[model samples]
Target: SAPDSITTLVEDHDGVSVVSVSGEIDMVTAPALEQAIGAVVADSPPALVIDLSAVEFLGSVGLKILAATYEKLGKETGFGVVARGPATRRPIHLTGLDKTFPLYPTLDDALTAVRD
Candidate 1:
């Protein structure tokens, strides 16, 4: 069952699919997040931007999901993330996962980078 605390919104901009996620991302909600991103990944878009600016909590499970998604996408598709504040950024930074994916401070920047 998907928890109501997390919501994923998909939108496209300049051929890039932007998946905006909100609320907490923990063990209970990681599957929903994975499914949402997986759907977008299946489309084989040129670029994908995951916006985590609205995320309130990002656990290790969430990080693993992100890494898995990145790996699944491979180098064929551009992958970027918009992660701001400690909730999302701290764990990534502490675990050195920040280098695994391109982290953007803003959604616009992420979209632009992925689009280009």
Candidate 2:
């Protein structure tokens, strides 16, 4: 069987790096997600925003990736997430990550917050 498809686009806006993730994030595609975020973190940008508003599904593995990235960034790098739909937002909120990670309704909101 073929692996699930996931697309990650990293864009630099101002001083922040935005990782826009699309498609389903599951075990099969988790590594791609990790590597994409890892590469962005390697540059050590001032702020990082993960926009998942286009994601179709968000699994536990995806959640783990988000947590790990946030923890790795720590206080030095500002981090935020853009997840509007229940597909992504509900799981994050249910897992109490909404509080642990800065949640934004839109990419613009995240960008503004992270830039601030």
Candidate 3:
């Protein structure tokens, strides 16, 4: 089988920094994902939303990155995640991460929720 490469795109939605991830997020390429997110996290944007709709696989390390970002951000800053499928949502829900932060099925929803 061929390996699927990971790709992360960071963008700004209003004042919220959005990061859309593609392919897999695991120990192998998780660092790249973390780095990309950290770049935006450091800015302390009004809010941060991560899009995992395109992710085929999401590992524990990947989950850690999100949690880390959430913890790193100040309480005044908002945080949200975009994921709604077995690959991403299941694990997140299974781990009860859903309780920690809001999970939106779409980026637009997350963007809206975070701002409010």
Candidate 4:
């Protein structure tokens, strides 16, 4: 059985919003994930956290979305992602985008970064 994959948005301390996403992130679901990030940025959070620990797959399109989101949000606020396992980090590293955005080992690390 799948882990009930879904995307969600939430506000953490001091207006920082975290976008938690799960499941395979391919061309089909990449747009929805981008939209979720957009929704958080629209709220004008102090920082944004994209949690990808639950993600099982990440395609090129998904990597594009992450890069675009970082480019968009990096101008006004802190934009980062927490991607665990090879499924998530491999794509980012393969595309050479690992240097573009700050990636943490876990969601808690990303959240802590926002707190500081």
Worst 10 residues of 4 by lDDT: 1-10
Single out the weakest 10-residue window by summed lDDT for candidate 1: 1-10
Query: Candidate 3 lDDT, tens digit per residue, 9-41?
Result: 998877888899999988889889988988898
Candidate 2 lDDT, 14-34, residue by residue in tens: 888999998999999999999
Reference-based TM-score, model 1: 0.92
lDDT of 4 by residue, 32-96 (tens): 77777787777777788888887887788888888888877756687778898899998888888
Instruction: Order the candidates by TM-score, highest first.
Output: 2, 3, 1, 4
lDDT of 4: 0.78
- Taking all chains together, each candidate's TM-score versus the true structure is 0.92, 0.95, 0.94, 0.85
Off by over 4 Å in 4: 1-6, 9-14, 74-76
The residue-by-residue lDDT of candidate 1 on 1-116, one tens digit each, is 24548989999887989999998899888888998999999999888888999998888998998888888995779888899998899998898877888899999888777766
